Amino acid sequence: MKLFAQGTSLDLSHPHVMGILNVTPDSFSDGGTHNSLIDAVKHANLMINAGATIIDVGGESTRPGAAEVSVEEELQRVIPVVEAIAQRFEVWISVDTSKPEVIRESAKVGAHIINDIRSLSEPGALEAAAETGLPVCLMHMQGNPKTMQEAPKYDDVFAEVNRYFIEQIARCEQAGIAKEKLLLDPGFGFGKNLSHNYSLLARLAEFHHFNLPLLVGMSRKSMIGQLLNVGPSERLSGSLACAVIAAMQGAHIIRVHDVKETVEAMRVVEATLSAKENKRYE
């Protein structure tokens, strides 16, 4: 199973570690792109050296209570970073944005994947994505990402995620985006309580019925912090366990903050699955 973008390919035969590079106004400080660029390129370098095969560049925070970012603010931070990395390294670059101008401007500087947690729901996003012909990640979410509001109720969270996926795949094809260009992500922590999150992880293997790559992001999330009752900087062990459970079930891309450690853990999973008559646990 491979992805094709920007004259290159990504083989999904093994788990890939996607490192996170957030370049928001509150971190990519001192205003409209400071010498925070060296910082970003430095940070990327470490991630690559640690074994990341994909880097997720985002100019907007999607945490509860997060501010909205303007197209200008976003453009100012993401584009320069995407370009500097594309020019310097061979990694795959995914862009975490929901804005059509950022989508368009990103393809042009070499981005390989459009990771929109909003699944191209913003006016003009679907059309901008299609035009680029790049792979798109579709994520399940109930509500507004940045709501300090409570988690919905679900009749059955897994059935709802499944049906959402069917509907979104359809929407994409109707717009020109071939099913073969999609990645699916259940969206851990988004409009889901503790129970819902562990139900989605327990049954991850059942989402293979779509025959599409699966991307997951549990790193330092609430589903861990709540369970173990620990702060954000004390969640590495839990984070690692979630990555292993997902990978063991055949997830293809794991979004994380702790690249080195996850890569090691993934090396153990690969050794195991290769000795496993059918390459996956269910």
Contacts with ligand SAN by CB under 6 A lie at 62-63, 189, 219-221, 232
Q: How far apart are CA 140 and CA 119, in angstroms?
A: 8
136-139: strand order across its sheet? 182-185, 136-139, 113-116, 92-96, 54-58, 16-22, 253-256, 215-216
Residue 255 within binding range of ligand PH2, rule CB under 6 A: yes
3-state DSSP assignment of residue 33: helix
Residue 28 within binding range of ligand PH2, rule CB under 6 A: no
The catalytic residue among 221, 235, 276, 280 is: 221
Residue 62 within binding range of ligand PH2, rule CB under 6 A: yes
- Report what 191 binds from ligand PH2, ligand SAN, none; CB cut-off 5-8 Å by kind: none
C-alpha distances in Å from residue 102, one per residue of 73, 93, 146, 260 = 10, 14, 20, 29
Work out the number of other CB atoms within 10 angstroms of the CB of residue 134.
22
Instruction: Assess contact for 217 and 255: CB atoms under 8 A.
Output: yes
Question: Is 179 considered catalytic here?
Answer: no
Tell me, by CB under 6 A, how many residues bind ligand PH2.
13
Question: Is 163 considered catalytic here?
Answer: no
Q: Closest Cα partner for 111 from 82, 84, 87, 137? A: 82
Q: Token digits for 50?
A: 């640690």
Taking the complex as a whole, the smallest distance from the CB of residue 34 to ligand PH2 amounts, in Å, to 23
Residue 185 within binding range of ligand PH2, rule CB under 6 A: yes
Q: Which stretch binds ligand PH2 (CB under 6 A): 75-83, 154-162, 180-188, 240-248?
A: 180-188
Could you list the residues known to form a binding site for 6-hydroxymethyl-7,8-dihydropterin, using ranges.
115, 185, 223
Catalytic residues: 221, 255
Residues that bind ligand PH2 (CB under 6 A): 62-63, 96, 115, 117, 137, 139, 185, 187-188, 215, 217, 255
